[PDB]
Amino acid sequence: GPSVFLFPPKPKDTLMISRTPEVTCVVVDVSHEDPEVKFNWYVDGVEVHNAKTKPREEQYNSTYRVVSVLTVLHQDWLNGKEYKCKVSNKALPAPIEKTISKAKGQPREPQVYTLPPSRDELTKNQVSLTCLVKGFYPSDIAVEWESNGQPENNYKTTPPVLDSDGSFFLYSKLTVDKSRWQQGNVFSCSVMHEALHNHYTQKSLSL
């Protein structure tokens, strides 16, 4: 029979008020003999009817996949409200309820430290600009780089690593042409996190 997977909003969407966070209920292995699926959405046990449900899309494995999308209020997600998708279908003798919420825990403010390339790396044509982000909790975070206000996306960020004090840390590595660094261009690490003031901080880095 069908199975259901419930997905949280992207952290950046929940932290920046202009963006649009969504909880997504995904139903897979919907059969052709019983293809009708009903969604019921609940926020802290209270039914809500503003979800937008997409039409069944057939998969290459001859099963249907039907998706319902619930737009959420930033502050509801951040305050730990619970989001329940209930999925009814004639092949389910009982519906499937999945419930999700923001990761729990006392929030801790990330400290953001930018680190220039090592001297040893200056023999290479590209150098590594490092953004250390430590002391944060919970682990939901967004880390981006830019220069002159424009995205610098040739970077890679480690997963959050649990540190010895219960907090998380990560590193972000931006790779740039050495000529850009030694000519004094300014790069900046931007970090978004619920424990930050206005959910946003930016640290710069230059020669």
Ligand X SMILES: *[C@@H]1O[C@H](CO[C@@H]2O[C@@H](C)[C@@H](O)[C@@H](O)[C@@H]2O)[C@@H](O[C@@H]2O[C@H](CO)[C@@H](O[C@@H]3O[C@H](CO[C@H]4O[C@H](CO)[C@@H](O)[C@H](O)[C@@H]4O[C@@H]4O[C@H](CO)[C@@H](O)[C@H](O)[C@H]4NC(C)=O)[C@@H](O)[C@H](O[C@H]4O[C@H](CO)[C@@H](O)[C@H](O)[C@@H]4O)[C@@H]3O)[C@H](O)[C@H]2NC(C)=O)[C@H](O)[C@H]1NC(C)=O
Ligand Y SMILES: *[C@@H]1O[C@H](CO[C@@H]2O[C@@H](C)[C@@H](O)[C@@H](O)[C@@H]2O)[C@@H](O[C@@H]2O[C@H](CO)[C@@H](O[C@@H]3O[C@H](CO[C@H]4O[C@H](CO)[C@@H](O)[C@H](O)[C@@H]4O[C@@H]4O[C@H](CO)[C@@H](O)[C@H](O)[C@H]4NC(C)=O)[C@@H](O)[C@H](O[C@H]4O[C@H](CO)[C@@H](O)[C@H](O)[C@@H]4O[C@@H]4O[C@H](CO)[C@@H](O)[C@H](O)[C@H]4NC(C)=O)[C@@H]3O)[C@H](O)[C@H]2NC(C)=O)[C@H](O)[C@H]1NC(C)=O
Binding site for its own copies (CB under 8 A): 111, 113-118, 120-121, 124, 128, 130, 132, 134, 154, 156-159, 161-164, 169-171, 173, 175, 203
Q: Considering the rule CB under 5 A, would residue 20 count as an interface residue with K ion? A: yes
Instruction: Pick the binder of Cl ion from 7, 10, 12, 16 (CB under 5 A).
Output: 16
Q: Which two tokens stand for residue 85?
A: 């998708």
Q: Which two tokens stand for residue 69?
A: 């999308």
- 3 state DSSP class of 185: coil
Instruction: Pick the binder of ligand Y from 15, 26, 174, 192 (CB under 6 A).
Output: 26
Q: What is the DSSP letter of 44?
A: T
Secondary structure E strands in 37-110: 37-43, 46-48, 52-53, 57-58, 64-71, 83-89, 96-100
Q: Considering the rule CB under 5 A, would residue 196 count as an interface residue with Cl ion? A: no
Q: Which two tokens stand for residue 61?
A: 């494995």
Q: Considering the rule CB under 6 A, would residue 59 count as an interface residue with ligand X? A: yes
Contacts to ligand X from residues 24-43, by CB under 6 A: 24, 26, 28-29
Closest approach of its own copies to the CB of residue 169, in Å: 6
For tokens 């930018």, what's the residue? Answer: 114
Q: Which two tokens stand for residue 64?
A: 């249907």
DSSP H or E segment with residue 14? helix 11-15
Contacts to ligand X from residues 60-119, by CB under 6 A: 60-61, 63, 65
Q: Cα separations (Å) of 157 from 73, 164, 189?
A: 28, 20, 11
Q: Cα separations (Å) of 101 from 18, 41, 49, 140?
A: 21, 13, 19, 12
Pick what 20 binds: ligand Y, its own copies, K ion, none; C-beta below 5 to 8 Å, kind-dependent.
K ion
Rounded to 5°, angle at Cα 30 from 25 and 36 = 85
Pick what 59 binds: its own copies, ligand X, K ion, none; C-beta below 5 to 8 Å, kind-dependent.
ligand X
Q: Considering the rule CB under 6 A, would residue 6 count as an interface residue with ligand X? A: no
Q: Considering the rule CB under 6 A, would residue 29 count as an interface residue with ligand Y? A: yes
Instruction: Pick the binder of ligand Y from 18, 60, 184, 198 (CB under 6 A).
Output: 60
> Does the bond joining 138 to the residue before it have cis omega, within 30 degrees of 0?
yes
Task: Write out the residues near K ion by the rule CB under 5 A.
Answer: 13, 20
Task: Write out the residues near ligand X by the rule CB under 6 A.
Answer: 3, 5, 7, 24, 26, 28-29, 59-61, 63, 65
Task: Write out the residues near ligand Y by the rule CB under 6 A.
Answer: 3, 5, 7, 24, 26, 28-29, 59-61, 63, 65
